[PDB]
Amino acid sequence: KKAKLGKSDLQVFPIGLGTNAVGGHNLYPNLNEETGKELVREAIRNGVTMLDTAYIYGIGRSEELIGEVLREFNREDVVIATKAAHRKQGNDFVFDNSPDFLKKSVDESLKRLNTDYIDLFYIHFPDEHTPKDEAVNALNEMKKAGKIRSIGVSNFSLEQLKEANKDGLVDVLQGEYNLLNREAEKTFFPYTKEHNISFIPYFPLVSGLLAGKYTEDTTFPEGDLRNEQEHFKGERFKENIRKVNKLAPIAEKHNVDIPHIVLAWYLARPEIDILIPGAKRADQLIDNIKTADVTLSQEDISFIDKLFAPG
Numbered sequence: 001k002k003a004k005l006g007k008s009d010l011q012v013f014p015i016g017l018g019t020n021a022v023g024g025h026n027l028y029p030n031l032n033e034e035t036g037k038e039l040v041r042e043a044i045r046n047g048v049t050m051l052d053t054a055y056i057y058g059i060g061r062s063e064e065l066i067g068e069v070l071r072e073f074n075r076e077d078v079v080i081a082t083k084a085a086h087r088k089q090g091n092d093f094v095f096d097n098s099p100d101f102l103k104k105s106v107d108e109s110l111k112r113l114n115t116d117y118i119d120l121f122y123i124h125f126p127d128e129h130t131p132k133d134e135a136v137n138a139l140n141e142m143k144k145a146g147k148i149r150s151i152g153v154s155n156f157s158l159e160q161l162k163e164a165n166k167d168g169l170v171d172v173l174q175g176e177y178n179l180l181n182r183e184a185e186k187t188f189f190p191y192t193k194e195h196n197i198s199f200i201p202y203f204p205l206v207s208g209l210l211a212g213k214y215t216e217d218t219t220f221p222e223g224d225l226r227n228e229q230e231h232f233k234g235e236r237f238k239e240n241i242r243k244v245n246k247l248a249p250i251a252e253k254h255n256v257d258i259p260h261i262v263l264a265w266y267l268a269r270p271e272i273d274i275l276i277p278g279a280k281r282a283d284q285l286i287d288n289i290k291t292a293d294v295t296l297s298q299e300d301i302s303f304i305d306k307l308f309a310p311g
């Protein structure tokens with residue numbers, strides 16, 4: 001129903017929405033913005049609390065579309081989480097965490113979202129030169145001014161996280177985590193759990209690989225970055241496909257699909273309070289929410305844990 005996100009006062013439905021496909025034209029071709037707006041709208045309608053966006057998502061367009069749909073509802077009923085770090089250069093970006101850039105980022109985010117505040121603001125990526133506790137202190141200024149209500153870091157190393165949380169101002173960590181890449185459990189979970197930092201994973205389905213989207217006979221076109229991901233190369237691809245299918249029975253048992261079981265597993269981790277599955281259309285959102293109805297047995301959780309053991 002409602003999960004508290006770590007040290008913050010954020011109460012959210014365990015299934016949030018990823019908005020990279022809402023006006024994220026730089027990421028996807030032929031996006032229909034009205035479809036994106038309708039998806040966001042549907043999400044809020046269906047009880048989703050958290051909308052996860054970022055500056056890179058359409059260079060601000062994602063925040064803009066979300067901002068338009070927001071006028072339709074009550075601001076206090078939605079948790080807006082956005083990020084910044086990408087600094088435009090030469091048709092490419094460089095990460096910037098300097099105080100001046102982060103504060104500017106917040107003010108520009110607020111204008112694009114057309115709102116008085118942002119619930120959760122992230123440092124999307126770490127830059128290589130700014131002391132991370134100073135970057136966070138900069139965001140902390142906007143927090144004190146009431147412009148953001150919580151701060152988070154993303155894609156930080158344990159060391160950079162420690163530095164950023166030097167004064168305990170980091171409430172959320174968003175990192176890459178899935179059944180094929182469980183490193184966070186050893187490298188981050190201990191610390192986050194300790195310091196009551198909520199952990200939000202991304203890339204939980206590994207491009208559909210862990211969602212039953214393919215078969216062992218699936219093939220991709222030359223140049224497709226997928227048949228170059230690694231978990232897709234050589235015997236790794238077939239191996240993971242054949243390994244994911246071993247979850248079919250559990251899915252059947254709970255009357256859902258493999259992706260629902262996979263995600264429910266992540267949610268079952270004491271260290272994770274919410275997921276941010278993506279979507280292009282409203283209907284897809286309604287299918288993501290079903291994950292929240294799943295309750296795996298300790299027996300199911302253990303099997304999956306062993307089945308997807310690192311080594």
Ligand SMILES: NC(=O)c1ccc[n+]([C@@H]2O[C@H](COP(=O)([O-])OP(=O)(O)OC[C@H]3O[C@@H](n4cnc5c(N)ncnc54)[C@H](OP(=O)(O)O)[C@@H]3O)[C@@H](O)[C@H]2O)c1
Pocket residue numbers: 018020124154155174202203204205206207208209211212213257259276277278287
């Ligand atoms: N740095 C950050 O903080 C951050 C945060 C979020 C995302 N990202 C990046 O954005 C990208 C997307 O992240 P993501 O978390 O959305 O990754 P993701 O786990 O790869 O997206 C889910 C993938 O699974 C498929 N899928 C979803 N639901 C499915 C279902 N019910 N049945 C079958 N297939 C299903 C989707 O296919 P279709 O699209 O074909 O439906 C999609 O390819 C990643 O490359 C990631 O690195 C970064």
Ligand code: NA
Pocket residue numbers: 267268269270271272273
């Ligand atoms: Na949990």
